[PDB]
Amino acid sequence: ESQLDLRVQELIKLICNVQAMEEMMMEMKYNTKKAPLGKLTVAQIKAGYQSLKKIEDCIRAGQHGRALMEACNEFYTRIPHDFGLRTPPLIRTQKELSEKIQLLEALGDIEIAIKLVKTELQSPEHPLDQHYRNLHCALRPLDHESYEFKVISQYLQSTHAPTHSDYTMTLLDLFEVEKDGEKEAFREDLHNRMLLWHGSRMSNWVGILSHGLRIAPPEAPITGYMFGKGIYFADMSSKSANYCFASRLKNTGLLLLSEVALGQCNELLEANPKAEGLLQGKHSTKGLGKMAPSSAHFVTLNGSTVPLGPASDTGILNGYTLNYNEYIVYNPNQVRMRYLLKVQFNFLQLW
């Protein structure tokens, strides 16, 4: 029998489920049958990113014919997909290229997860307890009556964007997060600390909790990252929640809240994959949104500003303009993971 709080038991059971990872990869068209997740290697993933660079080259030159077909076929050979009887689809847009980056990120997190979930041959501990220990990340459930639950609930609801109307979110459980080493590494000296959202797919949480949020590797396509290879956050819960890729079938997702040491922001109206080079002493990039929470409503929680909603106009308009802010830091030492929300997505099929 498990010695964990039942809330933690259910969380661990959810994120450490290998079959759920398999099903998630199958939904993304990855061929789990022919290329078992247990046998996938970091070298194979790295080569996958390299083949995306060649696709990126085609996209940035608007070459959509045989050169693109060949580049996509190379990627599909390295990272097996299951397209049934259909001609393999081409990867033609920045959006489609981003989906493939997301796949490789998920594969890397699953590679980590499969190693982590291995249990001891003989042990006095329940499997759930071994998985939990192997995270090296404390997860302490908070009561729904608590002040922290009240404020985080308010943050979640008040920053659900009105343009993200396809679903609502219900907070099922809330955990305080303390990742081994993060406090010691954190730039607690930097000003402008904010409590910001980060969403990710369900397959990714074992990786994120055990290794923290990470930046993209040098081999990844540069233009797959609209503000460069950093760690991306939102001040709108639903902007991050969209990156959970929850569905009617799998409607439980997680959202992470982290204390982010932004320091001096470099404010940008337009996307620039080379943004990190423009910092010139500044500590973070802020993609400037049309709509944002306003300072009048902000509260503090454990030394971080909480940008409570609702969102309203920022006076920012362009070319393209971001709907909502996004914040990018380029070193994990500017992040301290703080809360993990177990969220039920309630989908509305609107027409």
Ligand SMILES: COCCCN1Cc2cccc(C(N)=O)c2C1=O
């Ligand atoms: C290929 O991936 C590029 C980064 C994609 N982006 C952009 C972004 C903005 C705001 C929040 C988030 C988040 N995950 O919560 C993200 C995100 O993942």
